[PDB]
């Protein structure tokens, strides 16, 4: 999964999946992939 803000069924918390989740959780420090920049992704992370 590239990454999409999805509502987890329990606790109703916004959580990012895929590369977005890996980057936001600290497991990765940089994403180099065909990642399309848009409003939703740019709010939480910074794009070059």
């Amino acid at each position: 999964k590239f990454g999409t803000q999805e509502r987890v069924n329990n606790s109703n918390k916004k959580e990012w999946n895929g590369m977005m989740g890996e980057l936001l959780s600290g497991q990765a420090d940089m994403i180099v992939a065909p990642l399309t920049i848009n409003n939703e992704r740019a709010q939480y992370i910074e794009f070059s």
Partner: protein, 508 residues
């Protein structure tokens, strides 16, 4: 084995010891692996020294493995004292009614004192559910220095930041200093038409609401939502509370004291049964409060982890780690035109069900400006013009480019009544209505018509949108309505925005 459970009640309740014993009397296999010998007691009033003496005497003589405390007064000072007694004697205490039911923020980790109430987090969650249900996305937040306000504000911000509804939190207001003297008024002056989540004690909430009325913040479109902290004793209603003051609380009407005692006894019995199944046997209580016993005093096996997952009489009365009910019996009440707290909604299994599908307009005061900008609009579903859809499964609210609209759907073919389901209406006519609302600056309560179909004069009586409009049940019809001579005679039409004649369609 034998399990001794002590049930304490106050003198105000018109409840006798005999029926307290009978509450565990019919012997319907309530306790499978153990026999509960309920011992009951009533105290005239709850003051500290008598409380400690009574609890210690019941621990010594009756050798109780638990306790069920029910207080009559609203004194909030009893909850912490009960928690302290539970911490000292390791007696599982259950707050039932009155002061014992007031939720405490933080309890001693070594204490086994649980309460039958809703924490401030659950009250915030239910108020936010109310706000989401009525599409009150824009809102403000006015609080004071009353204890727990920081936690309330933090939880509100956290829930707003992690919700797909798209809340519009305008500002956070904290009137720490004097209300009518200092710069506080300036802050109260920058609040626009929205929902005000007010959190403060009743004595100062009266002043806050009076000042808001003096600042014109109590109009028809201003909805004040407050927690149970201010909406305390129902019988005491200050004259400064505007009508329509939405509040949430623990219900005392339906969920009676006898049911409370039965639920507490059932919870204790189920926890004891699960503990008997898991551990070896039921441990004897402490010897005495006094004497300064030389011992770590920590039981080898306790009732903490057994009270987490408890089910009784099909109800899920489980408790959280801190001591809050997982499924509290929360009720949503308002101040109607008769100045009496009237029940409106209820909160069961994480779902909020409201009696009113659409919020009725409440006259805040006798001098309030009459409501003319709010219009009731009828509509009929037409394929290209008015498309009716269900609520978005992702955000649980009406999506963009649509508007709320309540449809009165019948329960089934047998009964004659029905329920109003709030669906989302869109299409050409809805877009025209939205543009008209933005231009003329008027609000609307869209609702579909179920009586007729496009209007028809039967027995000199109109049905449909025409019928609703002529009989003053609504202000306007926005649906796909054809301008006809009789209709133009009965009701006044606007200019035609789209030409729709009578045409014949055939297969090619």
């Amino acid at each position: 084995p034998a399990l001794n459970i002590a049930v304490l009640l106050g003198h105000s309740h018109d409840v006798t010891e005999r029926e307290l014993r009978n509450l565990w009397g019919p012997e319907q296999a309530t306790g499978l692996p153990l026999d509960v010998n309920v011992v009951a007691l009533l105290m005239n009033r709850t003051d500290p020294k008598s409380l400690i003496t009574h609890v210690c005497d019941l621990m010594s003589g009756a050798r109780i493995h638990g306790l069920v405390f029910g207080d009559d007064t609203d004194q909030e000072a009893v909850a912490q004292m009960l928690d302290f007694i539970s911490s000292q004697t390791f007696i599982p205490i259950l707050g039932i009614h009155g002061g014992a039911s007031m939720i405490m923020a933080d309890k001693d980790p070594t204490s086994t004192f649980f309460q039958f109430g809703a924490s401030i987090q659950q009250q915030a969650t239910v108020m936010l559910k109310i706000m989401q249900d009525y599409d009150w996305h824009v809102f403000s937040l006015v609080t004071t220095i009353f204890p727990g306000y920081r936690d309330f504000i933090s939880f509100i911000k956290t829930t707003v930041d992690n919700s797909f509804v798209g809340w519009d939190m305008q500002n956070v207001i904290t009137l720490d200093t004097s209300f009518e003297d200092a710069k506080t008024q300036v802050q109260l002056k920058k609040i626009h038409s929205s929902v005000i989540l007010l959190y403060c004690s009743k004595d100062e909430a009266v002043l806050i609401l009076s000042e808001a009325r003096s600042l014109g913040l109590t109009g028809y479109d201003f909805f004040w939502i407050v927690p149970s902290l201010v909406s305390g004793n129902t019988e005491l209603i200050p004259k400064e509370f505007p009508s329509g003051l939405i509040s949430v609380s623990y219900d005392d009407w339906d969920y009676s004291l006898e049911a409370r005692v039965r639920d507490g006894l059932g919870i204790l019995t189920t926890a004891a049964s699960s503990m008997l199944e898991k551990f070896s046997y039921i441990p004897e209580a402490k010897a005495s409060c006094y004497g300064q016993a030389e011992k770590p005093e920590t039981p080898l096996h306790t009732l903490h982890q057994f009270m987490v997952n408890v089910t009784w009489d099909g109800k899920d009365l489980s408790f959280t780690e801190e001591g809050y009910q997982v499924h509290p019996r929360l009720v949503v009440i308002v101040l109607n035109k008769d100045r009496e707290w009237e029940k409106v909604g209820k909160w069961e299994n994480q779902t909020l069900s409201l009696r009113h599908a659409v919020w009725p307009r409440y006259k805040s005061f006798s001098d309030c400006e009459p409501d003319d900008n709010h219009l009731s609009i009828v509509t009929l579903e037409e394929a290209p013009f008015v498309i009716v859809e269900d609520i978005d499964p992702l955000t649980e609210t009406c999506v963009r480019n649509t508007v709320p609209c309540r449809k009165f759907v019948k329960i089934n073919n047998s009964t004659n009544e029905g329920m109003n389901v709030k669906k989302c209406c869109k299409g050409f006519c809805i877009d025209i209505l939205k543009k008209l609302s933005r231009t003329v600056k008027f609000t609307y309560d869209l609702y579909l018509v179920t009586n007729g179909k496009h209007g028809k004069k039967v027995n000199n009586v109109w049905n449909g949108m025409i019928g609703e409009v002529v009989y003053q049940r609504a202000v306007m019809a926005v649906g796909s309505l054809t301008i006809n001579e009789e209709r133009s005679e009965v009701v006044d039409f606007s200019v035609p925005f789209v030409e729709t004649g009578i045409s014949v369609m055939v297969s090619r």
